[model samples]
Target: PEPKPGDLIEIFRPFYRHWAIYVGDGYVVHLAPDILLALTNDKERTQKVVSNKRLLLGVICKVAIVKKELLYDVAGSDKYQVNNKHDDKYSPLPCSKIIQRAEELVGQEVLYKLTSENCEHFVNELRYGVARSDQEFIVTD
Candidate 1:
């Protein structure tokens, strides 16, 4: 229920960390695999939880928004973290502006790449004005 606007929440999966931004009112904007829609009532389903079947099949995706309750479900992990990263050099935009940016960009088609462009990149772009994936820094440095 930590759905404060601009709250950067993350759940570290077995392979990587999943990231998203809380846009207020119990909803979060995130990048998720489009294939999830094939399941029954994906819109509602995603708003509540994400199953392993959909996650393993993740490839194509969109910048989507879902309720905060489903966050743990989407991440499939109890260990949740917020603002997993920060850049002191660049101040973050106000949460109001950040939420607006996230809402405005919702539903946009995005090509999901593991190390190149991913969920971390999406929320980072909205919050810090840069789509940076820390996983990249971890693997390289």
Candidate 2:
């Protein structure tokens, strides 16, 4: 199913589900923990692909930037779906509000602690007014 504006897009990767907020026009807003830029504050390295080592260090150090990118660029070869899975428990914000909030946050770096702050939490906050990571629940057990 096609994702609607304000929907949460879940990308199923090898070890975890990476999350993004659909903001219309085939674009998505996600948290990219680019260790190079996050640590060094290097604006020139923004376009490079994030390596495993970079990701590990970033996650360990707990930092990331809110990036607005095409869904195609973010997903790589992974399978993804619009998983608005929190609608049952929390009412989603209006589509325009979610999209606008996500758009406004782009280009800002933030804490990316795995146990708390992460992509899922970022997207959930945009869509449902609460930041959470249910994926953390499954992995912790």
Candidate 3:
């Protein structure tokens, strides 16, 4: 059966992890290890693993929906409070831009097959120098 919005899923392959809620259409929204680490001020550790291809693959746990609005708000506002701690570094994208970009993806059905790739890119973005700066927030462009 297809998992619903509140369903909790556990991805146990590369790593043991869990995700819950925020599912709609086809995509699911749950914090992955990297995200969790980011939230906890462990970006350096996460970044190191992300830089290593082998270690990067070890970081798993799919079913995360990258909502620009949510990310932007979390980054832009004090919701995540990353700004205060990191000094605007590791914050989400700007709300206006995120909303503008999210508008383009609205109504599109998210696919489950792309979950792994999505997670991979999520880490890669952090690994490479793209969003490495303290000012760069993680959000789809």
Error of 2 at 90 (Å): 2.3
Worst 10 residues of 3 by lDDT: 75-84
Model 3: what TM-score?
Answer: 0.24
Predictions: Cα RMSD each: 15.2, 13.9, 17.4
Candidate 2 local accuracy as lDDT?
A: 0.73
What's the CA RMSD of model 2 in angstroms? 13.9
Candidate 1 residue-wise lDDT, 17-132, digit = tens: 77887776656777764432321222435656756444332243323333234455566644767773674577779867887877776655533333323565767788989645
Q: Which stretches of candidate 1 lie over 4 Å from their true place?
A: 1-3, 35-69, 111-141
Q: How many clashes would you count in candidate 1?
A: 0
lDDT of 2 by residue, 4-63 (tens): 899899999999999999999889999886653333233344578575333332232335
State how far residue 30 of model 2 sits from its true place (Å).
0.7
Model 3 lDDT tens row, 12-72: 3333333333233444344433322211122336745645433222222223344322322
Q: For candidate 1, give the lDDT of residue 43.
A: 44
Top-TM-score candidate index: 2
Those runs of model 2 whose alpha carbons end farther than 4 Å from true positions after fitting are 37-62, 111-141
Instruction: Give TM-scores for every candidate, taking all chains together and pairing residue i with residue i.
Output: 0.48, 0.60, 0.24
